[PDB]
Amino acid sequence: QGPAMAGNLYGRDGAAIGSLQKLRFFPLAVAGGQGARLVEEDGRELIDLSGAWGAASLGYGHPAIIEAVSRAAANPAGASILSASNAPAVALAERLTASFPGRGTHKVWFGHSGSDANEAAYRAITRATGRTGVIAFIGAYHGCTVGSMAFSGHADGLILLPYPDPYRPYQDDPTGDAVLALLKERLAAVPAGSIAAAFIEPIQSDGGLIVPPDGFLRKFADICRAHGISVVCDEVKVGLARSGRLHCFEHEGFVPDILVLGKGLGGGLPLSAVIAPAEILDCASAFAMQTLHGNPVCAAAGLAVLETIEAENLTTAAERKGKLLREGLARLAERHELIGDIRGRGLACGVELVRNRQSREPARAETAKLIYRAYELGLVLYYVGMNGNVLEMTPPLTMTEDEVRHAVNLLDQAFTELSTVSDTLVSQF
Template identity: 40%
Template sequence: MNSEELLQADSKIISNALKIRFYPITVKAAKGTKIIDHQDKEYLDLTAGWAVANTGYGDKRVADKLQEQYEALSFTTQLSAPEENMVHLAEKLISIIPGDFEKKVWFGHSGSDANECIAKLVPLSQNKPRMLSFMGGYHGQTLGSMSLSGHPAQSKFIGSGNVVKVPYPNPYRPLFGSKENLTGNIIDFIESEVFTTISPPEDTAGIVVEGIQSDGGLVVPPDDFLPELKKLCEDHNIYLIMDEVKVGLGRTGEWFSFDHASVAPDAVVLGKPLGGGMPISAVVGRKDILDAGTAVHMFTASGNPLSSAAALETLSIIKEEKLIRNAKEIGEYFSQQLCELQARYEIIGDVRGKGLAIGVELVEDGETKTPAIEETAAVCYRSYELGLLVYYVGIHSNVIEITPPLTITKEEVDFSISVLDQAFKDLEEKKIDIEKVRKYSGW
């Protein structure tokens, strides 16, 4: 089956509810940082499959571990007949997550069901009905995780009414009109407005937040935001929940985004890269949160032997191959090169990020900051034509997201910059076929 045949079959029989497409690629194979399509064309992948392939594609250590585990024990339902991989994985996760309190671990399949766990168990554990989260946040597609989200992708649906959403501190687009005291304005709004009206502290169980809003546009808050949010939670007996599904496990140049702020959350939500490509998610948190009920949030294949074995090996690879350091060093180099592009192309309004979680926001005008939506899609499409895979995100669909495998090299960054440079040049010279671009709506 060639690419055209596969895309036709996909269009005919695969649900559109399962799709978000940016260009007509199909995938036959992948290795390291490269993806190969059905015409044997090779692409450098800056998406890591929505930040799943942190350790790269097809790592032999993970492949060997999966074969070994499948031959020894292909499956047991950990709900009723546990084996040791899940326990060892829980021990490992507890060891790398801060917090001087007794912790437990819950396992699932995806970031969505992990945040669903938070939506259920945090209010139950606190005996408080309400939760706070942030505009622009993306926490999943199930009812509870969707309710916690503040992203346009979920705006077509009505979630649970117990969640109040507040502004996220965006230095490039400050909602209160000024970058000055950005954190203070948000904290004051929560304390003086939200807490005194629709979500009083005695009814508020937890605050769910991303250390970097990923699908919201790679928004990096001010350095003092997470420490001040943690203090707010402590002052009002509210749990702080960090969603690290996309930016956790080394991507930002630390194990977790909140490590940059030296904050110890009450619970941490993990997913995407944890299994090295195998489906697995986790919540690591206070014992009283995760023991709030028995058999109240369980799935037959949770923590299964294959996914748990892959996750253990993935964590070892991240540590032993120093991928966190590589994310920090290569991420800094990547950001520097992108800033040089910004100096040459007025459409690039902002370059931001930490480590290898980088966002490039495109605007029609630097003063008004009007989102350059179609232009962003065009740059991503043209990059694909030139052998580079990037997606776009953001509540306005105008932020190029750069989240490559953490194994990416300086030479691969240089190639990426050369392709993006050409794509921006082609955009300026109107050499991109916009009709082709319009066939792929992305977000």
């Protein structure tokens, strides 16, 4: 608690920035970055296996993002989509709609964040249908605004379901059929046509990076469509190439009615999008708008991200580098009993820590200590999960094979030195 520490960048953050928006696990204080590496005020370098919770899709200082943002700042097509059309925003909407199977029928709404986008999707669908009921999952993370929290699991007529977890199956049913049956029984108890939409994550993020059982999401989508319920796929976390296909729903044998994007869409700038049927997004005007929505600098960044996914073959990169990561982690699991489950798709990877592999008892304290030690060793990653025991890895898609190796090595050391981290120091955060 001395003056030198209080005067460093982390101490100044405490004195100037309120705690309201902080989610802090260790005293990471960044002054710069390059590739998949962060540089602290003191000059210390770290590998960022978080990639800013997935937002730094192209890592730090990617030349495509430099080029686009500098170009747009020097010759910006205004500042907004609200009261003018602008070139970069329109080009972006065109590209996003062309990427999606509903390209002939769908349009785009632009926001600043995943929270904003999920709020707008819910508001538009309820307006369009005149119904407010909504299905979502327990543990779902759809945002942290009043409008997006109304159907988060982490609104009038909310039905919340368990998300089927192959490692901890609801009703001991590894197929997830018991969750579908539960949904049917819930729907039987409400008036016909009273549910407007279903929000789903195709890999549950904050819930624990939980890939649902084979077939489950297709079946779920079929139940929704049988009731005329719009299926909204929240791909803020696992979209745009991260899963090893461009859209994560490509792994799951269905196409949603509405696709929600964010995080890495902006490559480190604030950008989100909803791709929805024209009838949904055209049901009102001047209805869900913020002044800087569709600003050209952020639109330019989104174009750069899409262009770079193509130019650097990042779908295939994510699939290759995800296999490499998972190989490394499987080697770690030979040596460290704490590792209970390694899961995910592409470069959305979760590692669940347990005190015993038979019982699967969660290792909550151990996880928090692990990530603190990793920070000390020069690797940044966080945890998530209902039980606080799932390491989250969402590195930049451009992270090199060498940086994947180094991160795995640093993680190996963290696991070895877990214990060394004091309870008091960790409970500060």
